[PDB]
A paper describes a structure:
The ferritin protein superfamily, nearly ubiquitous throughout the tree of life, has evolved to address iron storage, iron toxicity and free radical formation. ,, Ferritins oxidize Fe­(II) to Fe­(III) and store it within the ferritin nanoparticle as hydrated ferric oxyhydroxide. First identified in hyperthermophilic archaea, DPSL forms a 12-subunit (dodecameric) nanocage that preferentially utilizes H2O2 as a substrate. ,,, For these reasons, DPSL was first perceived as a DPS-Like mini-ferritin. However, structural studies revealed a surprise; DPSL lacks the DPS ferroxidase site and instead retains a bacterioferritin-like ferroxidase center in the middle of the 4-helix bundle. For these reasons, DPSL is proposed to lie at the evolutionary interface between the mini- and maxi-ferritins. ,− Importantly, DPSL further differentiates itself from both the (bacterio)­ferritins and DPS by the presence of two conserved cysteine residues that are juxtaposed between the ferroxidase center and the exterior surface of the particle. Together, the conserved cysteines and the bacterioferritin-like ferroxidase center serve as hallmarks of the archaeal DPSL proteins that are easily identified within the sequence as a “thioferritin” motif, and serve to differentiate DPSL as a distinct member of the ferritin superfamily.
Further, if the mineral is indeed present as ferrihydrite, it also suggests a 3-fold axis in ferrihydrite (space group P63mc) should align coincident with a 3-fold axis in Pf-DPSL; and that if particles with a single crystallite could be identified, a C3 reconstruction might indeed resolve the mineral structure. To test this hypothesis, and because the 3-fold pores in DPSL are related to each other by D2 symmetry, the iron loaded data set was D2 symmetry expanded. Masks covering the densest mineral features coordinated by residues 168–171 at each of the four positions were then constructed and used to sort for the presence of mineral at the first site (lying on the z axis), but the absence of mineral at the remaining three sites. This identified 167,240 particles with significant iron density at a single 3-fold. Homogenous refinement with 3-fold (C3) symmetry then gave a map with strong mineral density for the C-terminal coordinated mineral along the Z axis. While the overall resolution of this map was 2.5 Å, the mineral is significantly less ordered. Nevertheless, there was clearly resolved density for a constellation of 4 iron atoms with tetrahedral geometry centered on the 3-fold axis. The density is proximal to residues 168–171 and highly similar to the 4Fe/4O cluster in the ferrihydrite structure of Michel et al. Further, when the Michel ferrihydrite crystal structure was symmetry expanded and superpositioned upon the modeled irons, we identified an extended ferrihydrite superstructure with 13 Fe and 18 O atoms that was consistent with the surrounding density.
Author numbering:
A (entry chain F), B (entry chain E), C (entry chain L), D (entry chain D), E (entry chain C), F (entry chain K), ...: 14 to 183
Amino acid sequence: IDVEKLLELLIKAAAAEFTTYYYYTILRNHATGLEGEAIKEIIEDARLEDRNHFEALVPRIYELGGELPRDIREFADLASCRDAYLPEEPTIENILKVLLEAERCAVGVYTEICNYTFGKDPRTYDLALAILHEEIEHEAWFEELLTGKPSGHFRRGKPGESPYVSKFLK
Amino acid sequence: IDVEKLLELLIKAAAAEFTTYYYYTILRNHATGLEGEAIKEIIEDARLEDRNHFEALVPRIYELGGELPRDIREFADLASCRDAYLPEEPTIENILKVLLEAERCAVGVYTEICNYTFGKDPRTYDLALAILHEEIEHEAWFEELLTGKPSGHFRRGKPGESPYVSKFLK
Amino acid sequence: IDVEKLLELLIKAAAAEFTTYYYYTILRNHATGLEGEAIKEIIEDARLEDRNHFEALVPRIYELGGELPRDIREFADLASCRDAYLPEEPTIENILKVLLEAERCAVGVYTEICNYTFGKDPRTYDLALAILHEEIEHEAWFEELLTGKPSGHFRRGKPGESPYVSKFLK
Amino acid sequence: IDVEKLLELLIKAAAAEFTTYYYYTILRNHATGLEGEAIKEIIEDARLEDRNHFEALVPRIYELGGELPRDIREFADLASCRDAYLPEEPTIENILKVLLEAERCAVGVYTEICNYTFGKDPRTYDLALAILHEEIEHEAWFEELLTGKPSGHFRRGKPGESPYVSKFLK
Amino acid sequence: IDVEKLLELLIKAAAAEFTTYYYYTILRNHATGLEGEAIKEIIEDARLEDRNHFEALVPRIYELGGELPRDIREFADLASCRDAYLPEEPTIENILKVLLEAERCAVGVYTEICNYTFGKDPRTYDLALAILHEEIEHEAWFEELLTGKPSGHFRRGKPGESPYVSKFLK
Amino acid sequence: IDVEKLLELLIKAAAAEFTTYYYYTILRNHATGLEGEAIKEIIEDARLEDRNHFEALVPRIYELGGELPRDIREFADLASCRDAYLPEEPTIENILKVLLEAERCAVGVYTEICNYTFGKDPRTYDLALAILHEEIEHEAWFEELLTGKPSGHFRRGKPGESPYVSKFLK
Amino acid sequence: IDVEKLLELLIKAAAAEFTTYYYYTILRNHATGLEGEAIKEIIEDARLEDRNHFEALVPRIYELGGELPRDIREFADLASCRDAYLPEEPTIENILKVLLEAERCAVGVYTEICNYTFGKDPRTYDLALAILHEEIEHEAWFEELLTGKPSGHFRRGKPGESPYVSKFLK
Amino acid sequence: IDVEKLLELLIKAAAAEFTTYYYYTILRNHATGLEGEAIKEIIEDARLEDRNHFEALVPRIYELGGELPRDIREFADLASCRDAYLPEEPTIENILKVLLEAERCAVGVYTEICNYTFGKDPRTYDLALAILHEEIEHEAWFEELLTGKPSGHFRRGKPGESPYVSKFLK
Amino acid sequence: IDVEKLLELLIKAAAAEFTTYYYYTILRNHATGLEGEAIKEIIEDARLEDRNHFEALVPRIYELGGELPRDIREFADLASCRDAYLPEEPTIENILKVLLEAERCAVGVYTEICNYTFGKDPRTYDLALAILHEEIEHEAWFEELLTGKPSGHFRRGKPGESPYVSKFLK
Amino acid sequence: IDVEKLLELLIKAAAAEFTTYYYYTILRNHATGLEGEAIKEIIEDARLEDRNHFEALVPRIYELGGELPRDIREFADLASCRDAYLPEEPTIENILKVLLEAERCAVGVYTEICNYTFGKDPRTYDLALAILHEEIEHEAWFEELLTGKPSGHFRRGKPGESPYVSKFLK
Amino acid sequence: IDVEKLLELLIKAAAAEFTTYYYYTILRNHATGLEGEAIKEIIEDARLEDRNHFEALVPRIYELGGELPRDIREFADLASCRDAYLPEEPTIENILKVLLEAERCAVGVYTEICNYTFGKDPRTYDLALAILHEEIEHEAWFEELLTGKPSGHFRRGKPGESPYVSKFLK
Amino acid sequence: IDVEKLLELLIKAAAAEFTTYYYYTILRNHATGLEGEAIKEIIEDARLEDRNHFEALVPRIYELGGELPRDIREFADLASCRDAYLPEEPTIENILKVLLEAERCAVGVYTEICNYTFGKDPRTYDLALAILHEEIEHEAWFEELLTGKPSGHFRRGKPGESPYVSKFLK
Ligand SMILES: [Fe+3]
Ligand SMILES: [Fe+3]
Ligand SMILES: [Fe+3]
Ligand SMILES: [Fe+3]
Ligand SMILES: [O]
Ligand SMILES: [O]
Ligand SMILES: [O]
Ligand SMILES: [O]
């Protein structure tokens, strides 16, 4: 592994997690009405776990000799995923579309990291796998709500419980 | 402060909390169907906290030299808010209207007490403020469900948790 | 079983529990002095459990096709027991007399329900039995304090612990 | 009591509980979309309690001299209730119909056991009563969701909490 | 019910529980060797629950107007079961025989009390039923160890957990 | 606000709390006999909370640039309240008189601090308000015991629980 | 140390603990009225700890090569202290006299064991010391209640907490 | 990876776990006598963890686009392992032989899934690895009991604790 | 109060909290060496509490009719405090200077909000007061470390414990 | 033992603990800067345990017929150790010297009590030993910090945990 | 006391505990089969407590001015007991013989330390006494299993619970 | 995989963990003074986790058919890493150098095992990975303290918490 290339992927992934934690706050607040009450805790589950994903990625970046960018504006510009902006018409189905594209991108970025660190950096692989477990579950929540495909997933007992990345958290 | 005038406000406020704890029991039970399952725990959250509000107001009444009325019928007639009766057509939106008017009146009565004890009775102000925190949150739950205005409030983890009046409880 | 006759008994029993929860609040507050400090937590134990008895009776009423009355004034008028009014002279022995009559009536009403649902409605029998366990223990607390007959009962570790009706509570 | 006749009733009841635990797994997973999210935890509550009912029935069968059948295929054929198959059109209301018939049959079988062991086998009566408490509550959940009749029941705090059969569990 | 006849049965039952708590202490200590290590916790489970049975029977005796005998020697003479004396040859199988006869007698005495208070004293019936649940489980433990008949019972998680008589304890 | 004048008030208030924690130790020990057993835990409740009041006041003194006096003898001389000395005849009613004057003085000193920091030092106001909540409750305990005036206050579950100043504690 | 002489002292001490656990049950139940409500939990504290003292003495008897007597009647006859019989007139002060003599004897017997195993059997000394800590505290509870001498002891948080003999318990 | 081939492997594996949860129930009940008491909790540990393995496999089947078979009879026929039938002579060693073959097959099937998803489906690999951790430990328990080969494994603190598949559970 | 002017202050305050949570992550990581190990948990305490301050401010913004800005870049530009950039020479004392200026500004912004909502918006005042409690404590930690002025403050037991804003959190 | 001479030693020891609890509060607050942050929790550990030592000594004084002095000024004058005054130059090494002399004196006074009650008053010996355990550990903390001699001791998990005197605390 | 002679005894005792923690690991793993499953947790109980004994002895060695040997080989050579080597024929009875001799030697060494520090070093005496409590219990476990002498000891609820040396642990 | 070659690696790795647990005990005790107080808990964190690594490696050795060596001297000679001897001049930086070389070697040995069991022994890979997670974190603690390179790692909440190898522990 070229460590610089892996450092870029991990920094971009952390930027994606950090901006997601802000943008899901707006998306949660606009999940109003009787329809939105059902999905509020699902958005809350994903948002707090995505904040935990930023908390697990940063220690690994500094173990590898990398650093967070000096300016937070530069951090936002580095996100591996497009901003989960609130839709021009914030209906429940339009918000769910935005959440689905945000979590499909997250599954893609952590699949990229796992495919790059497989058998070469076992710690980075295990961190990306732990997050990829939770990104896949986030994607299935929003896919079932939006499309109706049985995903077999239940709701978290507590928001931000993070069953897979907990061993990486303090 | 005229203590008699403040005792009247606190007794009428406690009567509002006590009758609400009965009338929300009826309202919870008629939140039936798929739509009502989402609001049942929100009604349960408010009803148990309103019961805690009665439990916190009564000790303050006796510290100030006041007493609860001898007869419970007289207590009911003294409620600062109109009875949250079940609507003639108990649809979910009609029930939500009743809950919204019940919590808007509760915000008004505790704003009246805070505006009256501000800088004169610091304990009575702090109790009324603690309840006013929860009444405002109750109103925002029902306003978001009925109208769809983003309120930013999440559901309680446990019903009757009462994060603001807990220090006044036993 | 005639369900209407059983619904009347259960509604009157719940009205008795609800008004007891209000009247024991007044009785607790007037158990003052050195004598009253000993019985305050005993009144508090009974009052909170009687509130739990109202919380367990209401779900059964709605399972049976019954409903709580629309107006809380009509609910109070339906109580199976006379109001536990504060005595004209609120001495400790006069308050204990009022508590004793309140809990002897409660044992009577739940014995009436058990004798009516024995072998016909096993759920209603089991609910009435669970409350009758606690009403009998409430009566023995006040009988020992007032008369001095050994009852063998200890004080609850926590008020409203409800060791018998807990399985019916949420 | 003819113990063989009671052993047949308990073995058929446990077969119903065991197959229900499998068939509710399929029903939970197809409760998709915005409507389904509301009932997923309700199906999850019933499925884990029905698994606890199998865990409590089996010890009693062996105390009475009975045994589970050697082959699991023979166990499935012995279920006291028709299989809760997924509907040909798995809409939310069609799934709710299947759940309603599954729990109405369970109330019937445990009423048959209680009516048979009343005053003759107190342990078998008490176990059947504890399960009948939970089957009645399961039926009222799905009856309220499908029809809108007020049932007065709240959601379990945790899935499979089993407030009534817990004393029979390990 | 003749209360005097029922008071005799409950006092004799409590005497059986109290002496069992002492005699099982001796039996536990002589369950030595590799064979006895397996049965030590099973004896300990039964002995601590039999102590809980004495703690639950005594309050009921005093509610009914009865009293424990003045002298503990008179209490021992009133035991409804023969003393679980240590065998002349304290082998594991001979000790198991003594434990089996002790628990078969206990099942008989509490079946006698249930058959006497069925539908006449609901509290006394419910207390005897709760103890009968645990005596039946105690008998099945020693029957499976001594004879090998499948009983379906698992060990208690903690000694003296008393899943059935806990609601009667303090 | 003149900070020196507020530092004097806070130092004198902390000296009152520190000496109270010693003098209530003596008062607790002389609450003997049957009458004194009821008030021992009430004295213990107040003494441990008064110790917590000293623990919350000292950090605020050092934030404002003040310091505790070098000598503990000088600290005692600065108490805002007269010493809660043991009465020459330590009867229960004489001890209660001493406790009542100690807590009436404490309400006065913290009402003085609140009246001085109202709208000018929000942190100092909030600390004095939190203690004033507990001083008022302490006064009501002893006023109810000594005079019999209904106060509406129940006993603390644990001594030194300090429901109002807990957020200021470590 | 003559082990036989020490085995006699420990067996007689355990017999005292066992009979005390029965006789304090009677004494607790007759601590009726308003006066007795204050001492009921104090008797309950001592009785459950004296039961723990029997639970800690028996293992030591078997480590030393001793055994409990075969017959429980022989065990009762070996008690180092006279039976704490209920007084002919069971007033609160007469019951307190019986409890005081019971605990003064217990302090004497464990001082005898400590004076005999000092510097020779460190385990037997440490067990007797742990019980002597609790017997001294039991004596001071009843001495303060009966005579009014300040003893400085507070009530246990939970009955039978046994702060000193806990390490010897299972 | 061909998803259809992987879906077949996971469905057959889930069928093995589900039937094992039933067949180990029979095997547990026939582990009687003094020898069987030692292995009862070991069978109980494996059976409850095998139930957890079914609960973890099903969500993955639905994420991958697969579904459980409509009929439970068809699910039983799909088990990747032969049924753990009770032996014709249910001795402890014959039962242990059945348990050993059941867990050796389970190690084989999850090794097959890991060898198929290695570096291609990281989530499916991680789920199969977590179960393979527990199947290997199950096999070592029964191998040590039957043959005596040192395996180094200790008993679970609680049945069904599932240290490796917990993150996949709800 | 002009609500728009108060919404601007609360949005700018929340932007300060959000950017602080990122910038303190960088500052924590460069608190290296032996000197920095002492301050790492102090920076961690402040950073997690500042994240809680953002979580408490956002719900209030939406109750008042305000919203978070659509773009996170716009949110960063609105921070009421200059960015806590890492110093060009990241020595411990240079880092402490940056932390001190960050928390002195935070005390100023929340003192501005309290001075604006004093007696007009009791909920907004109480939220700003709760944060001002923690900002003052954060400032005192860094002032004591950098300058040596006695502050009287101890370390948090757990990072992000937030003793003052906890009631505003979920 | 002359009880008066032992009462003097115990009263002087309690006065030392009480004044230490005040003087360590000042010493804690002046342990500022980067050097002082390391020793703040060590001073906090010792100060809260010394307060626990005062809480364990006082009950023993009243069991022995002694009493605390009427005036707190007289209590301070009786301290067995010189006041732990803040040094004229409050450097970290000068403060550590003051703490070392305070804890060397405490080890001396409790060694004096143990040498006086050895084999004569086992309860007083055990209390003094329990405190002497903690005083020795306090001395080793400050000796290692000041001089660098390996003491082998670790920091308390929680301040005032008091592992040795906890059995004497309520 | 000659501190050098006592330091040698404690270092040799710690060496015995450290090597025991390794040798019991081998002994645990060879306690295979049906017989060995009963004794596995008993060996595990002793081994984890012997590890705790090493953790408690080392701090005392450094308080007294002693140090652990530089090389671990030198530490092994200093063990006060012969190595608990696995028997040439690792049968259960041969393993039990090794465990019995290991714990008889440990009782001897701590009896030697207690007999040497009796009345001269109270902390060293109390530490050795706490370990001697557990060594005596360890010896009784293996003596009862090997010989069948009633020892009266029950199994630890959790391995390494260490009821007697816990106060010396961190 | 050649199992013998992997058994050698795991035995040498466990020998390294066992000796590290002893040598870090000496290193902890010599981390004296003000500088060493900061690193004492860091050494304690690593030492207790390295002890857990020995506890997780040993079961795997016995599953694979390997055994611990008979003699502990032979175990020490097999350590994969040189002994972490105390430096001739035990300064803080010299001790940190010894800790850094100890943990760099540990990262190397577990990287060797992971590189050898990748895709061939999934259980051995997962155990080595779990330890490698903690060895990497241990190395970064000592690298940041000695050199000052930002590592991003925080201190453990509790010593020996072992977030990664916990699932392999009992
Ligand atoms: Fe357990
Ligand atoms: Fe366990
Ligand atoms: Fe346990
Ligand atoms: Fe255990
Ligand atoms: O366990
Ligand atoms: O467990
Ligand atoms: O246990
Ligand atoms: O345990």
